[PDB]
Design a protein around this nucleic acid. Structure first.
Ligand code: MG
Length: 210
DNA sequence: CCCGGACCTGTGACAAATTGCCCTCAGACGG
DNA sequence: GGCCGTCTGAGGGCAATTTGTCACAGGTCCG
């Protein structure tokens, strides 16, 4: 299956995208990298890749695309829009998009890589952002270990504001995203909390390949 | 000693959003 | 050449689950 690669600057960038938007973004990076910023999406190709019907494919592309308007990306700082022109359909079942050409160098560079079959069953987008940022540290054999700061997790993944109360962070983000990875990817993941006084400051992740 | 306060934890409720499903019907194409 | 049967896909919806928000009980330590 397609091998996604991206500059580490994109893995650690600040942004908020849905699963459907993140799914399309993978194809943009694949399309762009296999070479002005103009990409294309076929409804029927998307459906076969992700095992959806054409109708629900159509719905996913359409709503994701109009929800891109006004979205911005921040590299740590400098902020950019993903799109500089609205999407449009020349043909039935075909969409044409204009990626901000200034993003190209950030896409292609100190890099991250994973096969598309690893993420296509993940549902929660925050969990996608976590699996991406663990791969950045993975070893050939498939293992690694990394400590991420909690304040940095929140800024980079742009978690909603009520998850700054740690028990909600635990219950609605951390446990759920570890559970999906262990149930939906080939990776086996564990963690432990680092504290300073009463505050929990970092999260320490360990992983191997099955 | 024991107090209210400033911290921390987990859970129970509800609201707002998302999931994969269903139904209709016209376009593009080929037989 | 030109009509129609079929595969697409562009729309309109649903109930069942997940995600996002906050009230309230119960732990600690300090002065
Ligand atoms: Mg969908």
């Amino acid at each position: 299956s397609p091998r996604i690669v991206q500059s580490n600057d994109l893995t650690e960038a600040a942004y908020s995208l849905s699963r459907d938007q993140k799914r399309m973004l993978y194809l943009f990076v694949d399309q762009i990298r296999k070479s002005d910023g103009i990409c294309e999406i076929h409804v029927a190709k998307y459906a076969e890749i992700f095992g959806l019907t054409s109708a629900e494919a159509s719905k996913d592309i359409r709503q994701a695309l109009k929800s891109f308007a006004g979205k911005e990306v921040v590299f740590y700082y400098e902020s950019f829009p993903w799109f500089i022109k609205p999407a449009h359909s020349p043909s039935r079942g075909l969409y044409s998009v204009h990626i901000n050409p200034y993003l190209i160098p950030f896409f292609i560079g100190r890099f991250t890589q994973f096969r598309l079959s690893e993420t296509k069953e993940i549902t929660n987008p925050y969990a996608m952002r976590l699996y991406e940022s663990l791969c950045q540290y993975r070893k050939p054999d498939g293992s690694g270990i990394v400590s991420l700061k909690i304040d940095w997790i929140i800024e980079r993944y742009q978690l909603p504001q009520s998850y700054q109360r740690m028990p909600d962070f635990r219950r609605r983000f951390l446990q759920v995203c570890v559970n999906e990875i262990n149930s939906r990817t080939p990776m086996r993941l564990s963690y432990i909390e680092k504290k300073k006084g009463r505050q929990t400051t970092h999260i320490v992740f360990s992983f191997r390949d099955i």
